Amino acid sequence: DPFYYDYETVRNGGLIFAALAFIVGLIIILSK
Amino acid sequence: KERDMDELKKEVSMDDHKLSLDELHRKYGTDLSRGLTPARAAEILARDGPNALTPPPTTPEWVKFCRQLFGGFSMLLWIGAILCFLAYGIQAATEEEPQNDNLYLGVVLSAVVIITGCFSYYQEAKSSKIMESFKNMVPQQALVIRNGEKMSINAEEVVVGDLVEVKGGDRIPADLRIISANGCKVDNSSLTGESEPQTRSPDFTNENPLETRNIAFFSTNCVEGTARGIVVYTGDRTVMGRIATLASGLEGGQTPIAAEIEHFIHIITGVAVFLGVSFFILSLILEYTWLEAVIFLIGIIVANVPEGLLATVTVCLTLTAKRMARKNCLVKNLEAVETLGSTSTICSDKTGTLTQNRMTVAHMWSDNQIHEADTTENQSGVSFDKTSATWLALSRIAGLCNRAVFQANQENLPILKRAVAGDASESALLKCIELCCGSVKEMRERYTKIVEIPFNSTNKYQLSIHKNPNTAEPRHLLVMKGAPERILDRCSSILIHGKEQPLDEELKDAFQNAYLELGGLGERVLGFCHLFLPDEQFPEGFQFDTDDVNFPLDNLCFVGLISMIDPPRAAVPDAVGKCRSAGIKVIMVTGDHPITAKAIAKGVGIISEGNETVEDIAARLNIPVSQVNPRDAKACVVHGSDLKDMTSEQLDDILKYHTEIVFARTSPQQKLIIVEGCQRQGAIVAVTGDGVNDSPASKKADIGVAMGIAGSDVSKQAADMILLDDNFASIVTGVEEGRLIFDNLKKSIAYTLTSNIPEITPFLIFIIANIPLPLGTVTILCIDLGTDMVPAISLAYEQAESDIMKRQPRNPKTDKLVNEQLISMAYGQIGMIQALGGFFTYFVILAENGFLPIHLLGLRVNWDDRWINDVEDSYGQQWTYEQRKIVEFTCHTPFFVTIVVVQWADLVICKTRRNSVFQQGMKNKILIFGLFEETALAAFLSYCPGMGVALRMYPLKPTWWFCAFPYSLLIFVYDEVRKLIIRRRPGGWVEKETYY
Amino acid sequence: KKFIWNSEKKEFLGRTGGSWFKILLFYVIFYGCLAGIFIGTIQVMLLTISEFKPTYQDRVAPPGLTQIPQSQKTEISFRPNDPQSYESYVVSIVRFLEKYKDLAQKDDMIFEDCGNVPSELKERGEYNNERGERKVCRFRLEWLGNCSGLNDETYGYKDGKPCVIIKLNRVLGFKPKPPKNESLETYPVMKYNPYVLPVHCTGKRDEDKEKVGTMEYFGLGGYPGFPLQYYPYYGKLLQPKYLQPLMAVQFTNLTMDTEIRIECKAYGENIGYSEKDRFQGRFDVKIEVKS
Numbered sequence A: 001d002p003f004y005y006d007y008e009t010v011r012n013g014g015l016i017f018a019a020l021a022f023i024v025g026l027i028i029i030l031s032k
Numbered sequence B: 001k002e003r004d005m006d007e008l009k010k011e012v013s014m015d016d017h018k019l020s021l022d023e024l025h026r027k028y029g030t031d032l033s034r035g036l037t038p039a040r041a042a043e044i045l046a047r048d049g050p051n052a053l054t055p056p057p058t059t060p061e062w063v064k065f066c067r068q069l070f071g072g073f074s075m076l077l078w079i080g081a082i083l084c085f086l087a088y089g090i091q092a093a094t095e096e097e098p099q100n101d102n103l104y105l106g107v108v109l110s111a112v113v114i115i116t117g118c119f120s121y122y123q124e125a126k127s128s129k130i131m132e133s134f135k136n137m138v139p140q141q142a143l144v145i146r147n148g149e150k151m152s153i154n155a156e157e158v159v160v161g162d163l164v165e166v167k168g169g170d171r172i173p174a175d176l177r178i179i180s181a182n183g184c185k186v187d188n189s190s191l192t193g194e195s196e197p198q199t200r201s202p203d204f205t206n207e208n209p210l211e212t213r214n215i216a217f218f219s220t221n222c223v224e225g226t227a228r229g230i231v232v233y234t235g236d237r238t239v240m241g242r243i244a245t246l247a248s249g250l251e252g253g254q255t256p257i258a259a260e261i262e263h264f265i266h267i268i269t270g271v272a273v274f275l276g277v278s279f280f281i282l283s284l285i286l287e288y289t290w291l292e293a294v295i296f297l298i299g300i301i302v303a304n305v306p307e308g309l310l311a312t313v314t315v316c317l318t319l320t321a322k323r324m325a326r327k328n329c330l331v332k333n334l335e336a337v338e339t340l341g342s343t344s345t346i347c348s349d350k351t352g353t354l355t356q357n358r359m360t361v362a363h364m365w366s367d368n369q370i371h372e373a374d375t376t377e378n379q380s381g382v383s384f385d386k387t388s389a390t391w392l393a394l395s396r397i398a399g400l401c402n403r404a405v406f407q408a409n410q411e412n413l414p415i416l417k418r419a420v421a422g423d424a425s426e427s428a429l430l431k432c433i434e435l436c437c438g439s440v441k442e443m444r445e446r447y448t449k450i451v452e453i454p455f456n457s458t459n460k461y462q463l464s465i466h467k468n469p470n471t472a473e474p475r476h477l478l479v480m481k482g483a484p485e486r487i488l489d490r491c492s493s494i495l496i497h498g499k500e501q502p503l504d505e506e507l508k509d510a511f512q513n514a515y516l517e518l519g520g521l522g523e524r525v526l527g528f529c530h531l532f533l534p535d536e537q538f539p540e541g542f543q544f545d546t547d548d549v550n551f552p553l554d555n556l557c558f559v560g561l562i563s564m565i566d567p568p569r570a571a572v573p574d575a576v577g578k579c580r581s582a583g584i585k586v587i588m589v590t591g592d593h594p595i596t597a598k599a600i601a602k603g604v605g606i607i608s609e610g611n612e613t614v615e616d617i618a619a620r621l622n623i624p625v626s627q628v629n630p631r632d633a634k635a636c637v638v639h640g641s642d643l644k645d646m647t648s649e650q651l652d653d654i655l656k657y658h659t660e661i662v663f664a665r666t667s668p669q670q671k672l673i674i675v676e677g678c679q680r681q682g683a684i685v686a687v688t689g690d691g692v693n694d695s696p697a698s699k700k701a702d703i704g705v706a707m708g709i710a711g712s713d714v715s716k717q718a719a720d721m722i723l724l725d726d727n728f729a730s731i732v733t734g735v736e737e738g739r740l741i742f743d744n745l746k747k748s749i750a751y752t753l754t755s756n757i758p759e760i761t762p763f764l765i766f767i768i769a770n771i772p773l774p775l776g777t778v779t780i781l782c783i784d785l786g787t788d789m790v791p792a793i794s795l796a797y798e799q800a801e802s803d804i805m806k807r808q809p810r811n812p813k814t815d816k817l818v819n820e821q822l823i824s825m826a827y828g829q830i831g832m833i834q835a836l837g838g839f840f841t842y843f844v845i846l847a848e849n850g851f852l853p854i855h856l857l858g859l860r861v862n863w864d865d866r867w868i869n870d871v872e873d874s875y876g877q878q879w880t881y882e883q884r885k886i887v888e889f890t891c892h893t894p895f896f897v898t899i900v901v902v903q904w905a906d907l908v909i910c911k912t913r914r915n916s917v918f919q920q921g922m923k924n925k926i927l928i929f930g931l932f933e934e935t936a937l938a939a940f941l942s943y944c945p946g947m948g949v950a951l952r953m954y955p956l957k958p959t960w961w962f963c964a965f966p967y968s969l970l971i972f973v974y975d976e977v978r979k980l981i982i983r984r985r986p987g988g989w990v991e992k993e994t995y996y
Numbered sequence C: 001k002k003f004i005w006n007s008e009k010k011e012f013l014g015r016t017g018g019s020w021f022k023i024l025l026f027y028v029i030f031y032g033c034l035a036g037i038f039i040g041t042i043q044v045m046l047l048t049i050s051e052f053k054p055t056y057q058d059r060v061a062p063p064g065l066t067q068i069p070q071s072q073k074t075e076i077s078f079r080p081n082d083p084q085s086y087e088s089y090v091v092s093i094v095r096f097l098e099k100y101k102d103l104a105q106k107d108d109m110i111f112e113d114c115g116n117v118p119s120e121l122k123e124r125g126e127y128n129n130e131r132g133e134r135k136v137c138r139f140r141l142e143w144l145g146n147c148s149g150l151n152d153e154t155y156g157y158k159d160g161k162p163c164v165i166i167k168l169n170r171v172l173g174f175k176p177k178p179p180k181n182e183s184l185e186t187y188p189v190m191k192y193n194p195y196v197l198p199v200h201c202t203g204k205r206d207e208d209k210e211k212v213g214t215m216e217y218f219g220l221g222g223y224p225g226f227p228l229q230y231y232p233y234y235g236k237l238l239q240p241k242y243l244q245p246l247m248a249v250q251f252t253n254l255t256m257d258t259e260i261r262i263e264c265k266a267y268g269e270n271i272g273y274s275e276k277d278r279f280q281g282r283f284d285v286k287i288e289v290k291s
Ligand SMILES: *[C@@H]1O[C@H](CO)[C@@H](O[C@@H]2O[C@H](CO)[C@@H](O)[C@H](O)[C@H]2NC(C)=O)[C@H](O)[C@H]1NC(C)=O
Pocket: C145, C146, C216
């Protein structure tokens, strides 16, 4: 039915993106 | 009535020193050789107060915490919180089921102010805490003669009118009136700035109590000799006491950064109330009532108040102050970190600040040639030639014929900073021999001294005879030193490369010109000579008792002169050059003698080589000084004696027509007068000093710089910045950082001020077009105090785009921190595009869910209604209340995300004000993390489970993340062509209209 | 310092005349370009959506359940005697049913007589524009017995024992699916389970359920629900003047001078509910006939 949206997949992707972007930024400020 | 009290303290002191010993003992009632009875001493001790300055005014910690809770920026946020609670109070009593938004915002603004206060308070308190760790006040007991007996009592138990004795090394307790001296030399450096140890004689010499020798002063140290005296002044009534009390009771002024923030708030609230009032009238003209229009006015005014710019500006200043504390340049006041950059006229002190305040061997004479020795504080200079026989003889004459030796603990300390017991001149000689000629311990004991002759009161000469340890000649080695005029009369032989020659005038006149060269250079010169006593007329058994002529006074062998002076610190000349390069006027203000002040000025850079004073031209032309036109003289020396008879206009002319000025023999009060004269011109002033005489000058100056170790406690407390390492180059670093953080603050402010247009425009058109609310309040908080915090803080880490130490100091009346160009950029061009991008994402979300944009007009009337659950969209569908409200909140979330997307480009373009993003480069790692954290945080606030419940932020369909991309690219390209036209065309359109 | 208004060297409000013209011209060109850009992008956005169907329809998954007296707080408080006390209600009922009169549904080119008995769904092809303007099934007021009447311009409704009709939220392409014959305890209802969306009202607690004595439902042919022959909806563009099904509910035995809560819950598989939106699927009302 067109009255359904897979919000769990989009939400999961957004949380994974936020996690990767934040850990990458942390690697950016830790130049070693 | 404290005005009169301060006025009687701005005047130079008076005295009664010029009195016969009988008139003095009659006025004070004291025995000249027995002092007074202990009962009389206790009666005065319990009559006027102990001999100690009244403690400073204690500053309770709740006072400065409330201070951090107030100010100019925090006050704007306070009025914003008050307006929020006023609006909420109106909304509570007047309408049904009032909204908690305004209350939420008011408590948030209050929390922002309180947190900023806690942070800034902890920082200033940390600075003062590490400052208390520098007060090493060791009690010092004075030697007082009372009832005919000598007793050592605490300095505070000393009273007025009692006999006091001081020994070489002891500190002058109170202000004494010398009655009997024995070759006594005191140290008036920390008080009157007099570098060389000024001797103290019982006879009155000068009408000025500071210049005369019959007066010892509070906080001064008796260098050599012993003396007696009657205490004339005690406690706060003393000279340095009146100076310290004047310093404590002076005005601090308004720092330039503070005035800039105030002007910034003036423009912020100006446009805020303009928009609020014009929209209040517009709302009443449309349909809304006074009840609603008042809430609109408060919402528009409060919305235009940067809530996070306070914490960002504070952290900016804190970061730069952190770098200052890293280089041992501590700032007591936070905003004081910026004043150095805005400075345009530096008034410096000579003794202890421009110089090392220590006698050092400057130049030597040998083979009719001048040899300059290394006079740096850390020994990082050129070393003279130390392989000739003339040096091997002169070094022994100095290392042997000298009453100077190291003390007990002088082992691990360096050769220069270590303490030496004796005369300052002999100390400089001992250090130079111990540094450039091995060691003087084994060199002095190698030549066993037989008979010596110390310095004489007339024809000052110091001689001594020693045994000869050479394995080729057993003749006695006699050495003697003294003034060159006393040694020239007792010399016939001259040493050269190892052999002797007669006193031919061809080289004797060359010695005279060398003497006048080292003398005219402001240095003190001495002559050294020696002679081999014939072991045939004075065998090894004969004892030359110091009674008659046992040594030939004349026919000696002169080896060479040895000059000495207090040399400037290592990086002092280079620092002065850097300051002048940045367009900062350097003016020396010292109480030392003019003959030495002019030499040190020319040696450090205050007086450029080639420039002539009003007297130099008259001397070069052999004409009276009253004839030369002062306009033909760029530099000028102003004596303190003449400064006393000056008016305001005269001092104004001295500073306006003379570029290199040197104030000599100036009292601390005159130093304050000079600082005020410089401030009358309207320029930022920085006073750099160490002694107590720098307290009233460092206090009244826009920014005071005290020496962390070589400085006095009074001027160190009355200052605004401390140099814990005494590295005068820190002044240059300070003037650089002060300009650096200034420009970075401009960038950071333009960033926070750009986000206000897309934060207010949704509400504005919500009032006009009557469309559903495009942007929510909590989302606005997630932008101002959420994402944008890291980019704005990272904007402080930006470096110089061009050379900042090259441009002239900013004009306070022209280059303001937030000029009308920043408003035209943030509020006018960039923020406008960001607002359009937000509205685009808004219309995309609503048109895709069934509400075409054209249909959104006049829809908010029934949209916001909580009971109309059948709201027709553009497709004929019926929407309930919560369904369409879910769309409005899931419509606020992408508006916030759109803000972050446009802030990416806004941050990259604000990072560079004139250079291109490709020229400067994304080398700011904090900025990269700022964008990464900003985006990750924005995504987390939308996709975290339970956000549409707590913060009412619902998840976004991925295509929403791209509705804002073209606007960001547009912003970036627009600002890029802006900076490109500014680069290619530096004349006026793009520069005077948008370049802020 | 705030009298920079003018000078003999040409300045107005802060700057000169030629500078005012330069800045004004720049801002006009700049904002004009911004407007053209926003309009062009909004046009592309208009080109990404169709005229016969909304792109996203998930935010209206559970249809709502509204009523005719759009009360300020879903409360019906009036006096059985004072005609002005219940004027706000009757006005909205007459205005709502003004499009259901026999004279309003007179054109045979846009109206189609569905039938006196609820039948299966009526699918009129696809949602494209290849077909002409679809037909809308008629719904005469006579179906709502005891709450329609043959009154004059003013529908003399019920003073004592009021009437409250319910309506299902019009959704494009929505096909209502009533519950299976395996009804999980659905409060006595007729056996016409296959071609009508059931809607049953009740109290809210042990008190409201006792105060509300008897309720009488009215619908198509006498069934308490919505007939499937009127669905699905094909948008306002393709089906203008569409009349969604209606179903009236009358509360005969009420306790006068007492505010009682009623919950009219619509049942079905394609009918969702929500603890946050008391209108999604269900519907609430606070009736109080104070004499
Ligand atoms: C509609 O209202 C009428 C009253 O106008 C109801 O008619 C009554 O019905 C009862 C049976 O339930 C009879 O005993 C009465 O004699 C009738 N009175 C009149 C005046 O006709 C009718 O029942 C109502 N319809 C429904 C479906 O409840």
